[PDB]
Design a protein around this nucleic acid. Structure first.
Ligand SMILES: [Mg+2]
Length: 199
DNA sequence: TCGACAGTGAGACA
DNA sequence: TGTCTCATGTCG
């Protein structure tokens, strides 16, 4: 496989094109058709007098019997459906890793974005694999100390059919964003595969 | 609650 | 002047 290695102080990611266009088109259509997102209908749930947010506008699938936590609650993901198994297997096939969980986000146009954040490290093992379909969207890495010092910025279009692996310690020293882009009008679907520890 | 996203001011440039 | 990009406040 042909990989672009994105390297900098505390940043190890690599990027490749996982699926050719024909196949990326097919899979995208199947995703749009088949994935079931949480609606907005239920925002919060309260226990012991303290509220807890409930996932909205995302879908989670994973292995039977698995549980993950979210905003303090413990959930079960939907069991895998075939298009996701197909995608998981290609990722596995090209990295040597296994994954038991995927978080799917849909960005219906360039107004949908994600603000700077660092993944919830607490429940993970190991590399996060991010697979993109639909419209190309720029993805941005900013160092968590850049205020103290001035560290470089790294900017990467995540293209249709692509795979971005984020390996240690990329998620420890750098925040990530998917910034707004008005010019972009078509939707993007992103799949983030993880391995949730049984411990 | 605290996580997703609304809101906003500075700067760029058309 | 108008839209965009970058980098604290709110609320369910
Ligand atoms: Mg993330």
């Amino acid at each position: 496989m042909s990989w672009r290695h994105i390297r900098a102080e505390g940043l190890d990611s690599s990027y490749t094109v996982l699926f050719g266009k024909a196949e990326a088109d097919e899979i995208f259509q199947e995703l749009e058709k088949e994935v079931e997102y949480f609606t907005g209908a239920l925002a919060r749930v309260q226990v012991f007098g303290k509220w807890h947010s409930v996932p909205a506008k995302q879908a989670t699938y994973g292995d039977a019997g698995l549980t993950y936590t979210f905003s303090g609650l413990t959930l079960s993901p939907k069991p895998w459906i075939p298009v996701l198994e197909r995608i998981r297997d290609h990722v596995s096939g090209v990295t040597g890793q296994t994954f038991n969980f995927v978080l799917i986000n849909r960005y219906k146009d360039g107004s949908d974005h994600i603000c700077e954040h660092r993944d919830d490290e607490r429940e993970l093992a190991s590399p996060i694999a991010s697979v993109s379909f639909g419209a190309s969207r720029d993805f941005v890495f900013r160092h968590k100390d850049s205020p103290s010092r001035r560290v470089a910025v790294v900017r990467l279009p995540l293209a249709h059919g692509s795979l971005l692996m984020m390996n240690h310690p990329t998620n420890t020293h750098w925040y990530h964003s998917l910034p707004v882009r008005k010019k972009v009008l078509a939707p993007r679907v992103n799949l983030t595969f993880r391995k949730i520890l049984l411990g």
